[PDB]
mmCIF file of C-alpha atoms in Angstrom:
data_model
loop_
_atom_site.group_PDB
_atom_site.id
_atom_site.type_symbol
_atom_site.label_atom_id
_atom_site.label_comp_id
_atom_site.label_asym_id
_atom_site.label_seq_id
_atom_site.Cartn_x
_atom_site.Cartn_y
_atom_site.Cartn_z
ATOM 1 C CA UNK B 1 12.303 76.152 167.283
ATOM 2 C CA UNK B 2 15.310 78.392 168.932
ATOM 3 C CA UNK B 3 14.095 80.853 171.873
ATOM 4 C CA UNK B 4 13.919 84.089 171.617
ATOM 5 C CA UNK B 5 13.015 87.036 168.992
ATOM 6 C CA UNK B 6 13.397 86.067 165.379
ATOM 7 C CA UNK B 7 13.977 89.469 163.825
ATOM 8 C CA UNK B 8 17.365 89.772 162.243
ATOM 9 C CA UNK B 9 17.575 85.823 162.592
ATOM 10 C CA UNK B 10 18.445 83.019 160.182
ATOM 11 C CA UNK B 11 14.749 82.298 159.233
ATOM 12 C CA UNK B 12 13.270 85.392 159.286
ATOM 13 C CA UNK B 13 11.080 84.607 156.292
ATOM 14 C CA UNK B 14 11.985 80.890 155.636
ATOM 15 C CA UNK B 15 8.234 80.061 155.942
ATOM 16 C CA UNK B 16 7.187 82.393 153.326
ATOM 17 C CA UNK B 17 8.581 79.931 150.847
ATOM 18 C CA UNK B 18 7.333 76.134 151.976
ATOM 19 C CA UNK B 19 4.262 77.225 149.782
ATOM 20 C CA UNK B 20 5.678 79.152 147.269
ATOM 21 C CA UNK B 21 9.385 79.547 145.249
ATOM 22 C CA UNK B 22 9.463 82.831 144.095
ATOM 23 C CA UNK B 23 10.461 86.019 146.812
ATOM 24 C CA UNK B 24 12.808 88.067 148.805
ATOM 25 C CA UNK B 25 14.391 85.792 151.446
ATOM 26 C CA UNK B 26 16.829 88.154 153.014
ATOM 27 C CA UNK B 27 17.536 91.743 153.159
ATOM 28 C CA UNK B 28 20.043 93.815 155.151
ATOM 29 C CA UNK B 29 21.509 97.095 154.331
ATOM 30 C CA UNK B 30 23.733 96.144 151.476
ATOM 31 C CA UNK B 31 22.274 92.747 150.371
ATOM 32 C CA UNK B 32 19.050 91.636 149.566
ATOM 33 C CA UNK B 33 19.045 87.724 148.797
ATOM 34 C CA UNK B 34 15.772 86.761 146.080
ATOM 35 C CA UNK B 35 15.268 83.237 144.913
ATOM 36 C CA UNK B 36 12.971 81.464 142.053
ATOM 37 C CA UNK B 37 12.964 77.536 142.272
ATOM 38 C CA UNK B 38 11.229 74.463 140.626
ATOM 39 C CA UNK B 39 10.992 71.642 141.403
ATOM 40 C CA UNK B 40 10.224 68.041 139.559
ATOM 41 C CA UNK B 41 10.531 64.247 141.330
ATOM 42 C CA UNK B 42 12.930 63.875 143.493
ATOM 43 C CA UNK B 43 15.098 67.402 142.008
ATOM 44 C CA UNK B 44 15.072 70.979 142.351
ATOM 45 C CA UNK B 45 16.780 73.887 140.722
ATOM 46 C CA UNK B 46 17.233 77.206 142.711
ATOM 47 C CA UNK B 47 18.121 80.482 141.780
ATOM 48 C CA UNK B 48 19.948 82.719 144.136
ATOM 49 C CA UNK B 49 19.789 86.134 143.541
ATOM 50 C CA UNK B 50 22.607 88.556 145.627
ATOM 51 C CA UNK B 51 21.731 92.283 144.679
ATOM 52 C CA UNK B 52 23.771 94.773 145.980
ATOM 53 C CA UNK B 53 22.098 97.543 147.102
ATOM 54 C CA UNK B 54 25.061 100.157 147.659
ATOM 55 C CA UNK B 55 26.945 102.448 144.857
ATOM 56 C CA UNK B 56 30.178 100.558 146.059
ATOM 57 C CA UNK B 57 31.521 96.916 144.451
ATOM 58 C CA UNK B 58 31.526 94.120 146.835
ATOM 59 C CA UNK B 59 34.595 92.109 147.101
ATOM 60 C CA UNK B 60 35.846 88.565 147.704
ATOM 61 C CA UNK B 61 31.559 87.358 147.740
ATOM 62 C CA UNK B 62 31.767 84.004 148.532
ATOM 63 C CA UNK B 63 28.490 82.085 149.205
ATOM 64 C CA UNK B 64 28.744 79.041 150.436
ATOM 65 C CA UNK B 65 25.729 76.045 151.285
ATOM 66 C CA UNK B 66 25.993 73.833 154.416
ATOM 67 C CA UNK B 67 23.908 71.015 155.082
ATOM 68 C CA UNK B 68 24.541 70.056 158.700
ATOM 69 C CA UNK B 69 25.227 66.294 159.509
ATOM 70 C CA UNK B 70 22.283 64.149 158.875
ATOM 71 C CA UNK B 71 21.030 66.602 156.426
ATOM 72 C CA UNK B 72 23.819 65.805 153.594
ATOM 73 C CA UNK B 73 22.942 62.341 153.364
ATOM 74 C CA UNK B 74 19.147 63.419 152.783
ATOM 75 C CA UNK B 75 19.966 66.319 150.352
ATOM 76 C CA UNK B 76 22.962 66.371 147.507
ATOM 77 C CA UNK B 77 22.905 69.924 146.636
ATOM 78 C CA UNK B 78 25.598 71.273 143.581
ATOM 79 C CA UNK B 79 26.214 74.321 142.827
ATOM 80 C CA UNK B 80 29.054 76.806 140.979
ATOM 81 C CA UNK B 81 30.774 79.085 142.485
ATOM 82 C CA UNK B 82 29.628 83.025 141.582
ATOM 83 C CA UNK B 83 32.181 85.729 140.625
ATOM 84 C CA UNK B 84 33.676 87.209 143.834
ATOM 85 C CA UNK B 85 33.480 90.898 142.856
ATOM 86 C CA UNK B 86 29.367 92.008 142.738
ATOM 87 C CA UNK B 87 29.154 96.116 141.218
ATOM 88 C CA UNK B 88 27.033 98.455 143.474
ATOM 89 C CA UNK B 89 23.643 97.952 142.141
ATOM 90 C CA UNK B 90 24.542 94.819 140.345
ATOM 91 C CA UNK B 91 22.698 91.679 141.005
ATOM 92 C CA UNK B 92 24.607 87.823 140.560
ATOM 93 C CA UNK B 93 22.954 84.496 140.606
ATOM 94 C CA UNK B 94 23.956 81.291 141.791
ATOM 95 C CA UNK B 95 22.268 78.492 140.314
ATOM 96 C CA UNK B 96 21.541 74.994 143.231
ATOM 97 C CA UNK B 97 21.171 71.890 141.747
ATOM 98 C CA UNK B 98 19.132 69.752 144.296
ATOM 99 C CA UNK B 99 18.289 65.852 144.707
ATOM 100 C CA UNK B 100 16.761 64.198 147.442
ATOM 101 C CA UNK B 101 17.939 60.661 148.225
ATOM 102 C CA UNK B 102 15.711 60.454 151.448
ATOM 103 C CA UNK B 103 13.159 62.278 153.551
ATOM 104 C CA UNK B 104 14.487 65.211 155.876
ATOM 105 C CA UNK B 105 13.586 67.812 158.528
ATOM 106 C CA UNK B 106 16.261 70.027 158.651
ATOM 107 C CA UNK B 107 17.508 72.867 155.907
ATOM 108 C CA UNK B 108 20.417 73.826 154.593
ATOM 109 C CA UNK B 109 22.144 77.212 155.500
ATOM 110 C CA UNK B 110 23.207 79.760 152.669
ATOM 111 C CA UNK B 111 26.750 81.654 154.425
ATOM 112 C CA UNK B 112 27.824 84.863 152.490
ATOM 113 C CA UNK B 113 30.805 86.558 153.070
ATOM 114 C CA UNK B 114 32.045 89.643 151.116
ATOM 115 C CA UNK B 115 33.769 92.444 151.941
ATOM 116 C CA UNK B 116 32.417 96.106 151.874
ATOM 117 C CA UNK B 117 34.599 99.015 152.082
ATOM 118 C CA UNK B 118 37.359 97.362 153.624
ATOM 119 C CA UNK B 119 35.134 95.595 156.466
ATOM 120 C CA UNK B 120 34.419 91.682 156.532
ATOM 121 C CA UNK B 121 30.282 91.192 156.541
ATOM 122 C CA UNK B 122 28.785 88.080 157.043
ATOM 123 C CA UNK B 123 25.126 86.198 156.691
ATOM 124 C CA UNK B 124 23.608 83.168 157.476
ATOM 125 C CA UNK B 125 20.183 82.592 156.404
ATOM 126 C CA UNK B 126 18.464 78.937 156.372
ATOM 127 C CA UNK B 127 17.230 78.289 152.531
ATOM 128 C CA UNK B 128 13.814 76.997 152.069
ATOM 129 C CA UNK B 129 14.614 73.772 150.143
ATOM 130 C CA UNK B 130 11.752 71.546 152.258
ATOM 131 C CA UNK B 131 10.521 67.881 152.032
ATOM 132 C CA UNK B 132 6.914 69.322 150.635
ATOM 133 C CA UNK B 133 9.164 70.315 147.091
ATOM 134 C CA UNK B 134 8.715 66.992 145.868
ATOM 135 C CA UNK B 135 5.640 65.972 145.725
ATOM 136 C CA UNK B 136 3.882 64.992 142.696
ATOM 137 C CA UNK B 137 0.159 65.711 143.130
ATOM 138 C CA UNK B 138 -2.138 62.600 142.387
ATOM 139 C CA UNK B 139 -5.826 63.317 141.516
ATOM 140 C CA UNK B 140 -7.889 60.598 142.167
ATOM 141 C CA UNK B 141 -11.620 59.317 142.650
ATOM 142 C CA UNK B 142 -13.140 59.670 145.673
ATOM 143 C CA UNK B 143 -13.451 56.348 145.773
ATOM 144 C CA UNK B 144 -10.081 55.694 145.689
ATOM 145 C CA UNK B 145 -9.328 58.057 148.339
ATOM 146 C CA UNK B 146 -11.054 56.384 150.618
ATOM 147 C CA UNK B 147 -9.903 52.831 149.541
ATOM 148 C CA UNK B 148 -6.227 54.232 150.771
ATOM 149 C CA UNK B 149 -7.197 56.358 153.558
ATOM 150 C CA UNK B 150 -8.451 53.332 154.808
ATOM 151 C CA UNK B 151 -5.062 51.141 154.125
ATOM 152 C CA UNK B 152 -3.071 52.549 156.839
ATOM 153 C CA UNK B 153 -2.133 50.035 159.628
ATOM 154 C CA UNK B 154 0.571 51.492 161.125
ATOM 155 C CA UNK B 155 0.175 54.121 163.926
ATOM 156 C CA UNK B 156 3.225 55.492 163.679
ATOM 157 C CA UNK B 157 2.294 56.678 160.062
ATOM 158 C CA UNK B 158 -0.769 59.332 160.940
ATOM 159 C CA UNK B 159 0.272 62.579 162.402
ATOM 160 C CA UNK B 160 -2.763 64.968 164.140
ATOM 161 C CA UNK B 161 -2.542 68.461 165.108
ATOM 162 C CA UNK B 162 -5.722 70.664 166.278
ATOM 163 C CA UNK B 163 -4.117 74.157 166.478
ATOM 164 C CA UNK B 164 -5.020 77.475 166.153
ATOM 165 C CA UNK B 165 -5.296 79.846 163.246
ATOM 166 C CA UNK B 166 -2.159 82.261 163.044
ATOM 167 C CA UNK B 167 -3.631 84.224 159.865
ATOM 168 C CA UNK B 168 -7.285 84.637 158.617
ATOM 169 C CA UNK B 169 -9.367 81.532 157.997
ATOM 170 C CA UNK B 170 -9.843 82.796 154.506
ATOM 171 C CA UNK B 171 -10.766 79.766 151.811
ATOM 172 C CA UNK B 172 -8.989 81.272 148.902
ATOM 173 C CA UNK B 173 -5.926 81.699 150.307
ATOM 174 C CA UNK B 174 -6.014 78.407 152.530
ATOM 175 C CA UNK B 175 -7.055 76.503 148.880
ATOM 176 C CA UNK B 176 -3.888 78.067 147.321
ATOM 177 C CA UNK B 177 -1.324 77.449 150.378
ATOM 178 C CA UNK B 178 -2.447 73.976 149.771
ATOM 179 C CA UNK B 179 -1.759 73.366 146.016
ATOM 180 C CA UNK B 180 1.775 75.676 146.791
ATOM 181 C CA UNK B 181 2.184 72.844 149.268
ATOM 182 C CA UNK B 182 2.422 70.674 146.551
ATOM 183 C CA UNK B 183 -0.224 67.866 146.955
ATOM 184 C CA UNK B 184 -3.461 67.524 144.478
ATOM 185 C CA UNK B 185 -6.654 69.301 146.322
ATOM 186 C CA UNK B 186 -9.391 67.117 145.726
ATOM 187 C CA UNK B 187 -13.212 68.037 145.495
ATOM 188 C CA UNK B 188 -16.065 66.210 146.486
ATOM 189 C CA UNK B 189 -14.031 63.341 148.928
ATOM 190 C CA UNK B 190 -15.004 64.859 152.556
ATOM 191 C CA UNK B 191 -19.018 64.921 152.573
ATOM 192 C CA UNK B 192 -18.644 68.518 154.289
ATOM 193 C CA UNK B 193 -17.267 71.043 151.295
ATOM 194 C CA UNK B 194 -15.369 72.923 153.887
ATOM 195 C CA UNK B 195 -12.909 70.713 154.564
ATOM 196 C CA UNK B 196 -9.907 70.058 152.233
ATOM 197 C CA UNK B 197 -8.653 67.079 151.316
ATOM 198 C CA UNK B 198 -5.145 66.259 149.511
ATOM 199 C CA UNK B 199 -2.714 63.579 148.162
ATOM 200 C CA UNK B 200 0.634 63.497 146.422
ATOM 201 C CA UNK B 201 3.714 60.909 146.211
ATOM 202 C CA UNK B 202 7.118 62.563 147.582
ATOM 203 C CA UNK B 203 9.668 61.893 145.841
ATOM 204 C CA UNK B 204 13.314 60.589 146.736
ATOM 205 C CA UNK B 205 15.850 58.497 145.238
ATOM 206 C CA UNK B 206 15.649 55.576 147.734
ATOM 207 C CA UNK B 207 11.628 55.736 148.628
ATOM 208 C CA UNK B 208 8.331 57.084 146.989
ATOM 209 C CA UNK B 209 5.928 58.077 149.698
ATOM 210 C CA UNK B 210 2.184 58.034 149.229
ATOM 211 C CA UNK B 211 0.844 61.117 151.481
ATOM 212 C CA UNK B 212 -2.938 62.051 152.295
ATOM 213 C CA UNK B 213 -4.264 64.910 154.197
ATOM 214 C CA UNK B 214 -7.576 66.690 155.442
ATOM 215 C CA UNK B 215 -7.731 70.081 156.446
ATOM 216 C CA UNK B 216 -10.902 70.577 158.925
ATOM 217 C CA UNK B 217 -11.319 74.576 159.660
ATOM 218 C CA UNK B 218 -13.751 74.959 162.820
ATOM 219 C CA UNK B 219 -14.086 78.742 161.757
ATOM 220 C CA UNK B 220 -15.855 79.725 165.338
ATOM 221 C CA UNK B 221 -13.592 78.012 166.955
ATOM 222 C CA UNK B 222 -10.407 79.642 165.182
ATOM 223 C CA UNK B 223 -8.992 76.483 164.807
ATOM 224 C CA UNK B 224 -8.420 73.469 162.505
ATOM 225 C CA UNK B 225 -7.845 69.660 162.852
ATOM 226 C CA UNK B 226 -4.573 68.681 160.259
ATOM 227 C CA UNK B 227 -4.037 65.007 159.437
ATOM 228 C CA UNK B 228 -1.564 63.111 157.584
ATOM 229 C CA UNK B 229 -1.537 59.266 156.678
ATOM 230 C CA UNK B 230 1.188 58.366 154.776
ATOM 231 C CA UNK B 231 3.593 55.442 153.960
ATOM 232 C CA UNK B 232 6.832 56.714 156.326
ATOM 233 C CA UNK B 233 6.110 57.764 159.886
ATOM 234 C CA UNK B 234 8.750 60.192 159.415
ATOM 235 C CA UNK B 235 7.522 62.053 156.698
ATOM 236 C CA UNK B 236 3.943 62.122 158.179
ATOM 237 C CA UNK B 237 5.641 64.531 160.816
ATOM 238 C CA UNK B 238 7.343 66.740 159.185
ATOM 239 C CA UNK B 239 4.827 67.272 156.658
ATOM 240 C CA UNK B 240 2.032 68.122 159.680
ATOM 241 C CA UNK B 241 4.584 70.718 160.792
ATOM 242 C CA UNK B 242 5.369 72.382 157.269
ATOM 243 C CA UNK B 243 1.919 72.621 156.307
ATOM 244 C CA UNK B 244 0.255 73.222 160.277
ATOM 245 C CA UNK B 245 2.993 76.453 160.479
ATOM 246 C CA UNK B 246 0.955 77.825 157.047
ATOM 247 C CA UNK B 247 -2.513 78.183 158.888
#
């Protein structure tokens, strides 16, 4: 990612929300940005909430999403515009439509500008609409797990990362990071109950991607072994990055 410290940056908290919807994504002195979003196939809805914090009405607040280059292809995102002038206090929503036509990396950026006792503010923050949003979880036999674990031919399409723990190797919390992921969490596939296992379809409106992953924590060792086989190179990737970031 960029150099440098990330406090007061774009992302601040984007990866507070690859694993869940619902939270505060942004908040300054006079704004704080909140979102709820839900997903289903290949389409999302978002809610974006702009409360102002101050006694004093905002003016001219114009939000405004930008999906750079390649990214618009991948993601058609619609939205409404929201009334301009926000009360001190007052919160105003701005509803997203979202469809994905294919798989993609980067995210789209949320720009607000308002004015605020005469001055011109401005904010960019990146919004956490990520390829891991539409997937449809697919339980499955064990059996069958291993029938398509095993039906992957192409390199390219199985992503590894061994990397260390960045938060508590607590089971819990790694069990529900996975199903906020979005892929099923299957029982009783990997011999050793320790180790997760998942598997989901993403969703798009050109391709449906079969994805399956195993989680391996070496709790001594403070680190784990992530893999994902799936049916697009490219969406092996980015999903071992979402998901590896989590841990």
């Amino acid at each position: 990612g960029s150099p440098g410290i990330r406090l007061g940056s774009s992302e601040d908290n984007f990866a507070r929300f690859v694993c869940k919807n619902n939270g505060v994504l942004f908040e300054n002195q006079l704004l704080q940005i909140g979102l709820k979003s839900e997903f289903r196939q290949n389409l999302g809805r978002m809610f974006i909430f702009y409360g102002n914090k101050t006694s004093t009405q905002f003016l001219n607040f114009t939000p405004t999403l930008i999906c750079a280059d390649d990214l618009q292809t991948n993601l058609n995102l619609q939205t409404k515009p929201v009334d301009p002038t926000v009360d001190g206090g007052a919160q105003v929503q701005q509803v997203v439509n979202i469809e994905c036509i294919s798989d993609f990396t980067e995210a789209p950026v949320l720009n607000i500008q308002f004015r605020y006792g005469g001055t011109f503010q401005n904010v960019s923050v990146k919004l956490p609409i990520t390829l891991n949003k539409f997937f449809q979880p697919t339980e499955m036999a064990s059996q069958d797990f291993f029938q398509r674990w095993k039906q992957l031919s192409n390199p390219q399409q199985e992503v590894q990362n061994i990397f260390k723990a960045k938060h508590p190797m607590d089971t819990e919390i790694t069990k529900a990071k996975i199903i906020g992921f979005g892929s099923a969490l299957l029982e009783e596939v990997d011999p050793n109950p320790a180790n997760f296992v998942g598997a989901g379809i993403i969703h798009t409106k050109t391709t449906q991607i079969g994805c399956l992953l195993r989680l391996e924590p070496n709790l001594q060792a403070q680190m784990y072994r992530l893999t994902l086989r799936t049916s697009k190179d490219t969406v092996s990737q980015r999903l071992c990055e979402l998901l590896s970031e989590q841990f």
